[PDB]
Enzyme design. Structure first.
Site, PDB file in Angstrom:
ATOM      1  CD  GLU A  35      -9.853  -0.923  -0.607  1.00 40.46           C
ATOM      2  OE1 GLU A  35      -8.664  -2.280  -1.305  1.00 40.46           O
ATOM      3  OE2 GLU A  35     -10.187  -0.950   0.603  1.00 40.46           O
ATOM      4  CG  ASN A  46     -11.408 -11.888  -1.683  1.00 36.62           C
ATOM      5  OD1 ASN A  46     -10.603 -11.049  -1.116  1.00 36.62           O
ATOM      6  ND2 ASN A  46     -11.885 -11.446  -2.647  1.00 36.62           N
ATOM      7  CG  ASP A  49     -15.572 -14.704  -0.284  1.00 30.07           C
ATOM      8  OD1 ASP A  49     -14.208 -14.446  -1.208  1.00 30.07           O
ATOM      9  OD2 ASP A  49     -15.832 -13.067   0.409  1.00 30.07           O
ATOM     10  CB  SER A  51     -15.512 -12.585  -3.480  1.00 32.28           C
ATOM     11  OG  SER A  51     -14.466 -13.028  -2.480  1.00 32.28           O
ATOM     12  CG  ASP A  53     -11.556  -7.909  -3.411  1.00 36.61           C
ATOM     13  OD1 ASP A  53     -12.466  -7.401  -2.944  1.00 36.61           O
ATOM     14  OD2 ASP A  53     -10.725  -7.848  -2.390  1.00 36.61           O
ATOM     15  CG  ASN A  60     -15.605  -8.668  -2.987  1.00 40.73           C
ATOM     16  OD1 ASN A  60     -16.894  -9.276  -3.199  1.00 40.73           O
ATOM     17  ND2 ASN A  60     -14.937  -9.421  -3.002  1.00 40.73           N
TER      18      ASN A  60
END
Ligand code: NA
Length: 130
Positions: A35, A46, A49, A51, A53, A60
């Site tokens: 990750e 991202n 959408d 959002s 991380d 998220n």
């Protein structure tokens, strides 16, 4: 900060992650590795959408933490996403425990399925004294 492998392994064990909801320490290590490369300040936007991380586990913002700019989002860990960018990973760990308490468990992270599931993950904790 960027953790060294065994340093992180010992830290996670102390925080009670070994076997948490059936997830072995080596699996959490494999997840953090893929990750963020063990980096607490990593962020990934991202664009698809809107959002983002956050942190070592790349949690998220649409469901787990609040950053104010993510549309139709919730904050199940009841944390500011800023908390997931600290050098001290206590809060990130408490939130990761919340994520796995959900019906998908460790599978919630697609990266885990891609690089950890059904693989030899022993290597992530070998020689660490955990
Ligand atoms: Na949120």
């Amino acid at each position: 900060k960027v953790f060294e492998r065994c340093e992180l392994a010992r830290t996670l064990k102390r925080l009670g992650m070994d076997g948490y909801r059936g997830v072995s320490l080596a699996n959490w290590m494999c997840l953090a590795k893929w990750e963020s490369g063990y980096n607490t300040r990593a962020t990934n936007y991202n664009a698809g959408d809107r959002s983002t991380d956050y942190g070592i586990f790349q949690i998220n913002s649409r469901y787990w933490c609040n950053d104010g700019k993510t549309p139709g989002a919730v904050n199940a860990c009841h944390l500011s996403c800023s908390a997931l960018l600290q050098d001290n990973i206590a809060d990130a760990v408490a939130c990761a425990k919340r994520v796995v308490r959900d019906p998908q468990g460790i599978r919630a992270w697609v990266a885990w399925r891609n690089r950890c599931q059904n693989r030899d993950v022993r290597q992530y904790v070998q020689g660490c004294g955990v």
